[PDB]
Amino acid sequence: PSSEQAWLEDAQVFIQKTLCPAVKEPNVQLTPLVIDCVKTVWLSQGRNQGSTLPLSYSFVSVQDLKTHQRLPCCSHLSWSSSAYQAWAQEAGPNGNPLPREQLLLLGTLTDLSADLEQECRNGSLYVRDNTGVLSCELIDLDLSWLGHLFLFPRWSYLPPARWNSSGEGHLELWDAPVPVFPLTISPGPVTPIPVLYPESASCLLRLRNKLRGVQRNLAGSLVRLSALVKSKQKAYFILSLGRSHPAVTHVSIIVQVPAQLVWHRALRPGTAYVLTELRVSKIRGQRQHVWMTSQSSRLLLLKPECVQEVRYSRLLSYSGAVTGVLNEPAGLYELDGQLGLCLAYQQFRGLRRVMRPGVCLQLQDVHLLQSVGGGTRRPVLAPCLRGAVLLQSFSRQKPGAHSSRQAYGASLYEQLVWERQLGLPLYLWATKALEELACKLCPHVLRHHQFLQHSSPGSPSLGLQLLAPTLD
Amino acid sequence: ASSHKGCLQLRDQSGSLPCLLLAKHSQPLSDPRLIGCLVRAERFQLIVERDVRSSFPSWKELSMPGFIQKQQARVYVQFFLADALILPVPRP
């Protein structure tokens, strides 16, 4: 069939155009390597319909995907009718699974934001090629994977819903990214690296006069991870290292390096790691001292081969899945249809894009509240800045469509959370009253976005003004 | 303010409700700049008037159920304007 040869030639031209690097001369051997990798991935599953090549798949660039695709879509390699139906049944028969596509993508996994490389060092995962850069989210990652070409066998693209949203879109990857070509893997540190266990680190911290500019190495088991606090120009998150069983004593470490902010997506609880070249830092207003990550510091794991020596809330950790959505802008969600979850007191600006019904979440250091009152009865879990939310599995159901009309009111809710510093029951009652007022007045008297507008100077929101007499 | 009967009303998307507004301490509502504004009241009175056309024979049959023919109601709201809050509507 000449169609196969024509498609192969089109793939060759696509590689020549939008995949050949502009720094080095294009080595002609890249196309046979890409074709061989594609064929190997195609044949590994052993479910090919008698053709050594996937005739149904066509290459599409990142810019082409952005400019052409207008609906959510998930494309996977070697997904016949049986596999797609199994995936849909796994997604839940009640929900409608995302439509299937047959396309090919190639890009580089980079933490760099855009041409303004250091101006937006937020630690996000970005897929960049010649056409442009598009965001991605991974469950787990390895530091060696960045800066190299990777072939994507499974992905899901979600475009923005409402026309008033400036977000271009995002991508979600399910399986591990297959390397297109053998990456030059550098050997690790051959010489043994002695470290300090959490007991020794705590003993050193007990010696306040013996921490004057000493660059040492510390290691231990990851106990607690903090949220990614965002400031005007500085982002820092704190990881706790301490020996578990009993996990009584732990040593705090603050990560502030911009290029190493991607470690927020890498570290996982329970596993013990090794941190090298850590100095002493002083925090204003805190008597204790917390170790500082240095510029020439590397993230390592604990490898025994070379590492020689009025009511209250009950804190706990929970794991579950998201089933229902109560109030998207206010960060109110239902867990397993039995428990409520409130993300208001964290900074979940980047959680709305990915997390949706059909997603399993692993929470750490959350607070359980009961008998809240004020119109609500179910208990609500409200994580604070101490803990963090770890995504486990992506969702497969399509996002809702009604949210494109009556959902965007986010700025007022976050302003209520942070500026006025309201309590949780007051926040819930405020959300309920705002919904009632919106139903009563909007849309003839006032448009939905006008009523819940940001309370900037010179144009205060009517909802906040109406709620002020009770809130004060 | 209705343009067919000249009676003040409070209206939302749900419906309408006749109202009687007064200024502070026994003074009539005089300013006509309140047309189209938003009125919020925390202390107000709900008044219902009942009209019945009964045909009861005597005191013995007061509790019998077949001696009432016509029933009607009339609901409106009275409240002072000093205890309320007026907010302009930001037209685009």
Coordinates of C-alpha atoms in Angstrom, one line a residue:
Chain A
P1 CA 0.0 0.0 0.0
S2 CA 1.5 3.3 -1.2
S3 CA -0.4 5.1 1.6
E4 CA 2.0 3.7 4.2
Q5 CA 5.0 5.0 2.2
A6 CA 3.3 8.4 1.7
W7 CA 2.6 8.6 5.5
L8 CA 6.2 7.7 6.2
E9 CA 7.4 10.4 3.9
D10 CA 5.1 12.9 5.5
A11 CA 6.5 11.9 8.9
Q12 CA 10.1 12.3 7.6
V13 CA 9.2 15.8 6.3
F14 CA 7.6 16.6 9.7
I15 CA 10.7 15.5 11.5
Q16 CA 12.8 17.6 9.1
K17 CA 10.6 20.7 9.6
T18 CA 9.5 20.9 13.2
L19 CA 11.8 18.4 15.0
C20 CA 15.3 19.0 13.7
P21 CA 17.4 21.1 16.1
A22 CA 18.5 24.5 14.9
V23 CA 21.8 24.5 16.8
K24 CA 23.4 21.4 15.3
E25 CA 23.4 20.2 11.7
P26 CA 20.5 17.8 11.2
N27 CA 21.9 14.3 11.5
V28 CA 20.0 12.3 8.9
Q29 CA 19.9 9.2 11.3
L30 CA 17.2 10.9 13.5
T31 CA 14.3 9.8 11.3
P32 CA 15.2 6.0 11.2
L33 CA 15.7 6.1 14.9
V34 CA 12.3 7.8 15.5
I35 CA 10.6 5.3 13.1
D36 CA 12.3 2.3 14.8
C37 CA 11.3 3.6 18.2
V38 CA 7.7 4.1 17.0
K39 CA 7.6 0.6 15.5
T40 CA 9.0 -1.0 18.7
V41 CA 6.5 0.8 20.9
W42 CA 3.7 -0.2 18.4
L43 CA 4.8 -3.9 18.4
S44 CA 5.6 -4.2 22.2
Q45 CA 1.9 -4.5 23.1
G46 CA 1.5 -7.4 20.6
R47 CA -1.9 -6.1 19.5
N48 CA -1.2 -4.9 15.9
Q49 CA -3.8 -5.5 13.2
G50 CA -1.4 -7.2 10.9
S51 CA 0.5 -4.0 10.0
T52 CA 4.0 -3.3 11.3
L53 CA 3.2 0.4 11.4
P54 CA 0.3 2.4 12.9
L55 CA -1.4 3.7 9.8
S56 CA -4.1 5.3 11.8
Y57 CA -1.8 7.7 13.6
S58 CA -0.6 11.0 12.1
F59 CA 1.9 13.5 13.4
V60 CA 0.7 16.8 14.7
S61 CA 2.7 19.7 16.1
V62 CA 2.1 21.5 19.4
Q63 CA 1.0 24.7 17.6
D64 CA -1.2 22.7 15.3
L65 CA -2.9 21.0 18.2
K66 CA -3.4 24.4 19.9
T67 CA -4.8 26.0 16.8
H68 CA -7.0 23.1 15.5
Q69 CA -8.3 21.2 18.5
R70 CA -11.3 22.8 20.2
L71 CA -12.6 20.0 22.4
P72 CA -11.0 17.8 25.1
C73 CA -9.4 14.7 23.6
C74 CA -7.2 11.9 24.8
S75 CA -5.0 10.0 22.3
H76 CA -3.1 6.8 23.1
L77 CA -1.0 4.4 21.1
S78 CA -2.3 0.8 20.4
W79 CA -5.8 1.5 21.7
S80 CA -8.2 -0.6 19.7
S81 CA -11.9 -1.0 20.5
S82 CA -11.4 -3.5 23.3
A83 CA -8.8 -1.4 25.1
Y84 CA -10.8 1.8 24.7
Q85 CA -14.0 0.1 26.0
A86 CA -12.1 -1.3 29.0
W87 CA -10.7 2.2 29.7
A88 CA -14.2 3.7 29.4
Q89 CA -15.6 1.1 31.8
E90 CA -12.8 1.8 34.2
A91 CA -13.8 5.5 34.0
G92 CA -17.3 4.7 35.2
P93 CA -20.3 3.9 33.0
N94 CA -22.2 6.9 34.4
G95 CA -19.6 9.3 33.1
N96 CA -18.8 10.0 29.5
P97 CA -15.2 9.2 28.6
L98 CA -13.1 11.6 26.6
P99 CA -13.1 11.0 22.8
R100 CA -10.3 9.0 21.4
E101 CA -7.7 10.4 19.0
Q102 CA -4.9 8.9 16.9
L103 CA -2.0 11.4 16.8
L104 CA 1.7 11.5 17.5
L105 CA 3.6 14.1 19.6
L106 CA 7.3 14.7 20.2
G107 CA 8.8 17.2 22.6
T108 CA 11.2 17.9 25.4
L109 CA 10.4 17.7 29.1
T110 CA 11.6 21.0 30.5
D111 CA 11.0 23.0 33.6
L112 CA 11.6 26.3 31.7
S113 CA 8.6 28.4 31.3
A114 CA 9.1 30.2 28.0
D115 CA 11.6 32.4 26.1
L116 CA 11.6 34.3 29.4
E117 CA 13.4 31.4 31.0
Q118 CA 14.1 32.7 34.5
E119 CA 11.3 35.3 34.7
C120 CA 8.6 32.7 35.5
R121 CA 10.6 30.0 37.4
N122 CA 7.5 28.5 39.1
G123 CA 8.6 24.8 38.9
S124 CA 5.9 23.8 36.5
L125 CA 6.5 20.9 34.0
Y126 CA 6.5 22.1 30.4
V127 CA 6.7 20.3 27.0
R128 CA 8.6 22.5 24.5
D129 CA 9.4 21.9 20.9
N130 CA 10.1 24.2 17.9
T131 CA 6.4 25.3 17.6
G132 CA 6.0 26.3 21.2
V133 CA 5.6 25.2 24.8
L134 CA 2.6 23.5 26.4
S135 CA 2.2 22.4 30.0
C136 CA 2.1 18.9 31.3
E137 CA 1.6 17.1 34.6
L138 CA 3.3 13.9 35.7
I139 CA 2.6 11.6 38.7
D140 CA 6.4 10.9 39.1
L141 CA 9.6 12.1 37.5
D142 CA 13.3 11.6 37.5
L143 CA 15.8 14.5 37.3
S144 CA 17.7 12.8 34.5
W145 CA 14.7 13.0 32.2
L146 CA 14.7 16.8 31.7
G147 CA 16.3 18.3 28.6
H148 CA 15.9 15.3 26.3
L149 CA 13.5 14.3 23.6
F150 CA 10.7 11.9 24.7
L151 CA 8.0 10.0 22.8
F152 CA 4.5 10.2 24.3
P153 CA 2.4 7.0 24.1
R154 CA -0.5 8.3 26.2
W155 CA -1.8 11.9 26.7
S156 CA -4.9 13.9 27.2
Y157 CA -5.4 17.5 26.1
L158 CA -7.9 19.9 27.8
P159 CA -8.7 23.3 26.2
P160 CA -10.1 26.2 28.3
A161 CA -13.8 26.2 28.9
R162 CA -15.0 29.8 29.3
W163 CA -13.9 32.5 26.9
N164 CA -12.9 34.8 29.8
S165 CA -10.1 32.5 30.9
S166 CA -6.6 33.4 29.7
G167 CA -5.2 29.8 30.1
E168 CA -4.2 28.4 26.8
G169 CA -4.5 24.8 27.9
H170 CA -2.7 21.9 29.5
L171 CA -1.8 18.2 28.9
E172 CA -1.9 15.2 31.1
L173 CA 0.3 12.1 30.7
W174 CA -0.6 8.7 32.0
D175 CA 2.3 6.3 31.4
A176 CA 6.0 6.8 31.6
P177 CA 7.5 8.8 28.7
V178 CA 9.4 6.5 26.3
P179 CA 12.8 7.9 25.4
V180 CA 13.2 8.3 21.6
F181 CA 17.0 7.8 21.6
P182 CA 19.5 6.4 24.1
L183 CA 20.2 9.2 26.5
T184 CA 23.8 9.8 27.7
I185 CA 23.4 8.6 31.3
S186 CA 26.3 9.9 33.4
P187 CA 27.6 7.6 36.2
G188 CA 26.9 8.5 39.8
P189 CA 29.3 9.3 42.6
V190 CA 31.6 6.3 42.7
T191 CA 33.2 7.2 46.1
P192 CA 31.1 6.5 49.2
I193 CA 29.2 9.5 50.6
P194 CA 28.8 9.5 54.4
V195 CA 25.7 11.3 55.7
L196 CA 24.2 12.4 59.0
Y197 CA 21.1 10.5 60.3
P198 CA 18.3 12.6 61.7
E199 CA 19.4 11.9 65.3
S200 CA 22.8 13.3 64.6
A201 CA 21.3 16.3 62.7
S202 CA 19.1 17.0 65.7
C203 CA 22.1 16.7 68.0
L204 CA 24.0 19.2 65.9
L205 CA 20.9 21.5 66.0
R206 CA 21.1 21.2 69.8
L207 CA 24.6 22.7 69.5
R208 CA 23.7 26.3 68.7
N209 CA 27.4 27.5 68.8
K210 CA 28.7 24.8 66.4
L211 CA 26.9 25.8 63.2
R212 CA 29.0 28.7 61.9
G213 CA 29.3 28.3 58.2
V214 CA 29.7 24.5 58.0
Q215 CA 28.8 22.8 54.8
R216 CA 27.7 19.2 55.7
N217 CA 25.4 16.5 54.3
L218 CA 22.2 15.3 55.8
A219 CA 19.9 12.4 55.0
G220 CA 16.7 10.7 56.3
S221 CA 13.2 9.6 55.6
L222 CA 10.8 12.1 54.2
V223 CA 8.1 12.7 56.8
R224 CA 6.2 15.9 56.0
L225 CA 6.0 18.0 52.8
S226 CA 4.8 21.6 52.8
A227 CA 2.7 23.5 50.2
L228 CA 4.5 25.5 47.5
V229 CA 4.2 29.0 49.0
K230 CA 4.2 31.7 46.3
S231 CA 5.3 35.2 47.1
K232 CA 6.0 38.3 44.9
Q233 CA 9.3 37.0 43.5
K234 CA 10.4 34.1 45.8
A235 CA 9.0 30.6 46.1
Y236 CA 10.0 28.2 48.8
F237 CA 8.8 24.9 50.1
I238 CA 9.9 22.9 53.2
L239 CA 10.6 19.2 53.4
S240 CA 10.9 17.3 56.7
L241 CA 13.6 14.7 57.1
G242 CA 13.3 12.3 60.1
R243 CA 13.8 8.7 60.9
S244 CA 10.4 6.9 60.8
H245 CA 9.3 4.1 63.2
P246 CA 9.3 6.0 65.5
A247 CA 8.8 9.2 63.4
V248 CA 9.2 11.4 66.5
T249 CA 12.3 13.5 65.7
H250 CA 12.7 15.2 62.3
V251 CA 14.9 17.9 60.8
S252 CA 13.5 20.7 58.6
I253 CA 15.0 21.7 55.3
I254 CA 14.0 24.7 53.3
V255 CA 14.3 24.5 49.5
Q256 CA 14.7 27.9 47.8
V257 CA 16.8 27.3 44.7
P258 CA 14.8 28.4 41.7
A259 CA 16.1 25.7 39.3
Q260 CA 15.6 23.0 41.9
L261 CA 11.9 24.0 42.6
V262 CA 10.9 21.1 40.3
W263 CA 11.8 18.8 43.3
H264 CA 8.3 19.6 44.6
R265 CA 7.0 17.2 41.9
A266 CA 9.7 14.6 42.6
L267 CA 9.8 14.0 46.4
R268 CA 7.4 11.4 47.8
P269 CA 6.6 10.5 51.4
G270 CA 8.1 7.5 53.1
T271 CA 11.2 7.1 50.9
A272 CA 14.5 8.1 52.4
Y273 CA 16.8 10.4 50.4
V274 CA 20.2 11.9 50.7
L275 CA 20.9 15.7 50.6
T276 CA 24.4 17.0 50.1
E277 CA 26.0 20.5 50.6
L278 CA 23.5 21.9 53.1
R279 CA 24.5 25.1 55.0
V280 CA 22.9 26.9 58.0
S281 CA 20.3 29.6 57.5
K282 CA 18.6 32.0 60.0
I283 CA 15.0 33.0 59.8
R284 CA 13.8 36.3 61.3
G285 CA 11.5 35.9 64.2
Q286 CA 12.3 32.2 64.7
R287 CA 14.9 31.2 67.3
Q288 CA 15.6 27.8 65.7
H289 CA 17.9 27.4 62.6
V290 CA 16.8 25.5 59.5
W291 CA 19.3 24.0 57.0
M292 CA 19.6 25.8 53.6
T293 CA 20.0 24.2 50.2
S294 CA 23.1 25.4 48.4
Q295 CA 23.5 26.3 44.7
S296 CA 25.8 23.4 44.2
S297 CA 23.6 20.8 45.9
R298 CA 22.3 17.6 44.4
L299 CA 19.3 15.4 45.3
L300 CA 20.2 11.8 46.1
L301 CA 18.4 8.8 47.4
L302 CA 19.4 6.6 50.4
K303 CA 21.5 4.0 48.6
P304 CA 23.1 1.6 51.1
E305 CA 25.6 0.6 48.5
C306 CA 27.7 3.7 49.3
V307 CA 26.0 5.6 52.1
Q308 CA 27.8 4.7 55.3
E309 CA 27.2 6.4 58.7
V310 CA -14.9 25.9 70.8
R311 CA -13.7 22.6 69.6
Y312 CA -10.6 21.1 68.0
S313 CA -9.6 19.3 64.8
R314 CA -8.0 15.9 64.8
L315 CA -5.0 15.9 62.4
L316 CA -4.8 12.8 60.1
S317 CA -4.0 11.7 56.6
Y318 CA -6.6 10.4 54.2
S319 CA -6.7 8.9 50.7
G320 CA -9.7 8.9 48.4
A321 CA -11.2 9.9 45.1
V322 CA -13.2 12.9 43.9
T323 CA -16.7 12.2 42.8
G324 CA -18.8 15.4 43.0
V325 CA -18.2 19.1 42.6
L326 CA -20.1 21.5 44.8
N327 CA -18.5 24.9 44.1
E328 CA -15.6 25.0 41.7
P329 CA -14.4 28.6 42.2
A330 CA -14.5 28.3 46.0
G331 CA -12.6 25.0 46.1
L332 CA -15.4 22.9 47.6
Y333 CA -15.4 19.2 46.6
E334 CA -17.1 16.0 47.7
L335 CA -14.9 13.0 48.6
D336 CA -16.5 9.6 47.7
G337 CA -19.9 11.2 47.9
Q338 CA -19.8 11.1 51.7
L339 CA -17.2 13.7 52.8
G340 CA -16.5 17.3 51.9
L341 CA -13.2 18.8 51.0
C342 CA -12.2 22.5 51.2
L343 CA -9.0 23.7 49.4
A344 CA -9.7 27.4 50.1
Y345 CA -6.9 27.9 52.7
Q346 CA -4.2 26.6 50.4
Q347 CA -3.1 28.2 47.1
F348 CA -4.9 26.0 44.6
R349 CA -4.5 28.2 41.6
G350 CA -2.9 25.3 39.7
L351 CA -5.2 22.6 41.0
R352 CA -8.4 23.6 39.1
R353 CA -6.9 22.8 35.7
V354 CA -6.1 19.2 36.4
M355 CA -8.2 18.0 39.3
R356 CA -11.8 17.2 38.5
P357 CA -14.3 14.3 39.1
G358 CA -12.6 11.0 38.5
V359 CA -9.3 11.8 40.3
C360 CA -7.8 10.0 43.2
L361 CA -6.0 12.2 45.7
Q362 CA -3.5 11.4 48.5
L363 CA -3.6 14.0 51.3
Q364 CA -1.2 14.6 54.1
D365 CA -1.7 16.4 57.4
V366 CA -5.3 17.4 57.0
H367 CA -7.8 18.6 59.6
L368 CA -11.1 16.9 60.4
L369 CA -13.9 19.2 61.5
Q370 CA -17.3 18.1 62.8
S371 CA -20.6 19.9 63.7
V372 CA -19.6 23.0 61.7
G373 CA -23.2 24.2 61.6
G374 CA -24.5 27.1 59.6
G375 CA -26.5 25.1 57.1
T376 CA -24.0 22.3 56.5
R377 CA -23.8 19.0 58.3
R378 CA -21.3 16.7 56.6
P379 CA -17.7 16.8 57.9
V380 CA -15.2 18.7 55.8
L381 CA -11.5 18.1 55.5
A382 CA -9.6 21.4 55.2
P383 CA -5.8 21.1 54.6
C384 CA -3.6 23.9 55.7
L385 CA -0.3 25.3 54.5
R386 CA 1.5 22.7 56.7
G387 CA 0.5 19.8 54.5
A388 CA 0.2 19.2 50.8
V389 CA -2.0 17.5 48.2
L390 CA -0.5 14.8 46.0
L391 CA -2.3 13.8 42.8
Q392 CA -2.4 10.0 42.2
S393 CA -4.5 9.3 39.1
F394 CA -5.9 11.6 36.4
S395 CA -9.6 11.7 35.4
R396 CA -11.2 10.3 32.3
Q397 CA -14.6 11.9 32.2
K398 CA -15.2 15.1 30.2
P399 CA -15.4 18.4 32.2
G400 CA -18.7 20.0 32.7
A401 CA -20.1 22.5 30.3
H402 CA -22.5 24.6 32.6
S403 CA -19.4 25.9 34.4
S404 CA -18.7 28.0 31.3
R405 CA -21.6 30.2 32.3
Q406 CA -21.9 30.4 36.1
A407 CA -18.6 29.4 37.7
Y408 CA -16.0 32.2 37.3
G409 CA -16.1 34.1 40.6
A410 CA -12.7 33.0 42.0
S411 CA -11.2 36.4 42.9
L412 CA -13.8 37.3 45.5
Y413 CA -13.5 34.0 47.3
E414 CA -9.7 34.1 47.5
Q415 CA -9.8 37.7 48.6
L416 CA -12.3 36.7 51.4
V417 CA -9.9 33.9 52.4
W418 CA -6.7 35.9 52.5
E419 CA -7.6 39.6 53.0
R420 CA -10.4 39.4 55.5
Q421 CA -9.0 36.2 57.1
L422 CA -12.4 34.6 57.6
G423 CA -13.1 31.4 59.5
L424 CA -14.3 28.2 57.7
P425 CA -18.0 28.3 58.8
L426 CA -18.2 31.9 57.9
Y427 CA -16.6 31.1 54.5
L428 CA -19.2 28.3 53.9
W429 CA -22.1 30.6 54.9
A430 CA -20.7 33.4 52.7
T431 CA -20.6 31.0 49.7
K432 CA -24.2 29.9 50.3
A433 CA -25.4 33.5 50.7
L434 CA -23.6 34.5 47.5
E435 CA -25.2 31.6 45.6
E436 CA -28.6 32.7 47.0
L437 CA -28.0 36.4 46.0
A438 CA -26.8 35.4 42.5
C439 CA -30.0 33.3 42.0
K440 CA -32.2 36.1 43.3
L441 CA -30.7 39.0 41.3
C442 CA -28.7 37.7 38.3
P443 CA -28.7 37.7 35.3
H444 CA -31.3 40.4 34.3
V445 CA -30.5 42.9 37.1
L446 CA -26.7 42.2 36.9
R447 CA -24.5 39.9 34.9
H448 CA -22.9 37.0 36.8
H449 CA -19.3 38.2 36.3
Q450 CA -20.3 41.8 37.3
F451 CA -21.9 40.7 40.6
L452 CA -18.9 38.6 41.8
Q453 CA -16.3 40.9 40.4
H454 CA -12.9 41.5 42.0
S455 CA -13.1 44.1 44.8
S456 CA -10.4 46.4 43.3
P457 CA -10.3 50.0 44.4
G458 CA -12.7 52.3 42.5
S459 CA -15.2 49.5 41.7
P460 CA -16.2 47.4 44.8
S461 CA -18.2 44.2 44.3
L462 CA -21.9 44.4 45.2
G463 CA -21.8 41.0 46.8
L464 CA -19.2 41.9 49.3
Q465 CA -21.0 45.2 50.1
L466 CA -24.3 43.3 50.7
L467 CA -22.5 40.7 52.9
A468 CA -20.5 43.3 54.9
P469 CA -23.2 44.1 57.6
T470 CA -23.2 40.5 58.8
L471 CA -19.5 39.7 58.3
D472 CA -18.4 42.8 60.3
Chain B
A1 CA -42.3 53.0 40.5
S2 CA -45.1 51.6 38.2
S3 CA -46.0 53.7 35.2
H4 CA -49.6 52.5 35.1
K5 CA -50.9 52.9 38.7
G6 CA -48.3 55.1 40.5
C7 CA -47.6 52.6 43.3
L8 CA -44.2 51.9 44.8
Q9 CA -43.0 48.3 44.5
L10 CA -40.0 46.1 45.4
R11 CA -39.1 43.8 42.6
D12 CA -36.7 41.0 41.8
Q13 CA -36.6 38.2 39.3
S14 CA -38.9 36.1 41.5
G15 CA -41.8 38.6 41.5
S16 CA -43.1 41.8 43.2
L17 CA -44.3 43.0 46.6
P18 CA -46.0 46.4 47.3
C19 CA -44.2 48.5 49.8
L20 CA -44.8 51.6 52.0
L21 CA -41.6 53.6 52.7
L22 CA -41.2 56.4 55.2
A23 CA -38.3 58.7 56.1
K24 CA -37.0 59.1 59.6
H25 CA -39.5 59.9 62.4
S26 CA -42.8 60.6 60.7
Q27 CA -41.7 62.3 57.5
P28 CA -42.9 61.3 54.0
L29 CA -40.6 59.9 51.3
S30 CA -39.8 62.9 49.1
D31 CA -36.6 62.3 47.2
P32 CA -37.3 60.9 43.7
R33 CA -33.7 59.8 43.1
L34 CA -34.3 56.4 44.7
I35 CA -36.0 55.0 41.5
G36 CA -34.0 52.0 40.3
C37 CA -31.8 51.8 43.4
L38 CA -31.2 48.7 45.6
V39 CA -32.9 48.7 49.0
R40 CA -31.8 46.3 51.8
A41 CA -33.8 46.1 55.0
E42 CA -33.1 44.2 58.2
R43 CA -36.0 45.4 60.3
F44 CA -39.3 45.5 58.4
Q45 CA -43.0 44.6 59.0
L46 CA -45.0 42.1 56.9
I47 CA -48.7 43.1 57.0
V48 CA -51.6 40.8 55.8
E49 CA -55.2 41.9 55.6
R50 CA -58.0 39.4 55.5
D51 CA -61.5 39.8 54.0
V52 CA -64.1 37.2 54.5
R53 CA -67.8 37.0 53.4
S54 CA -69.3 34.8 56.0
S55 CA -72.9 33.6 56.5
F56 CA -72.8 32.2 60.0
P57 CA -76.3 31.6 61.5
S58 CA -75.4 32.1 65.2
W59 CA -72.7 31.4 67.8
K60 CA -73.4 27.7 67.9
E61 CA -72.2 27.0 64.4
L62 CA -69.0 29.1 64.6
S63 CA -66.7 26.1 64.0
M64 CA -68.7 24.5 61.2
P65 CA -66.7 24.5 57.9
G66 CA -69.4 25.2 55.3
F67 CA -70.2 28.8 56.3
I68 CA -67.3 30.6 54.5
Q69 CA -67.7 31.6 50.8
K70 CA -65.1 34.2 49.8
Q71 CA -61.5 34.6 51.1
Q72 CA -58.8 37.1 50.0
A73 CA -55.5 38.4 51.2
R74 CA -53.3 41.5 50.6
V75 CA -49.6 41.5 51.6
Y76 CA -47.3 44.5 51.7
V77 CA -44.2 45.7 53.6
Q78 CA -43.6 48.7 55.8
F79 CA -40.3 49.9 57.1
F80 CA -38.4 53.1 57.9
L81 CA -35.7 54.3 55.5
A82 CA -33.3 55.1 58.3
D83 CA -32.8 51.5 59.3
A84 CA -32.3 50.4 55.7
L85 CA -29.4 50.6 53.3
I86 CA -29.5 52.0 49.8
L87 CA -26.9 50.9 47.2
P88 CA -26.7 52.2 43.6
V89 CA -26.8 49.7 40.8
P90 CA -23.6 50.0 38.7
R91 CA -25.0 50.1 35.2
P92 CA -22.5 49.3 32.4

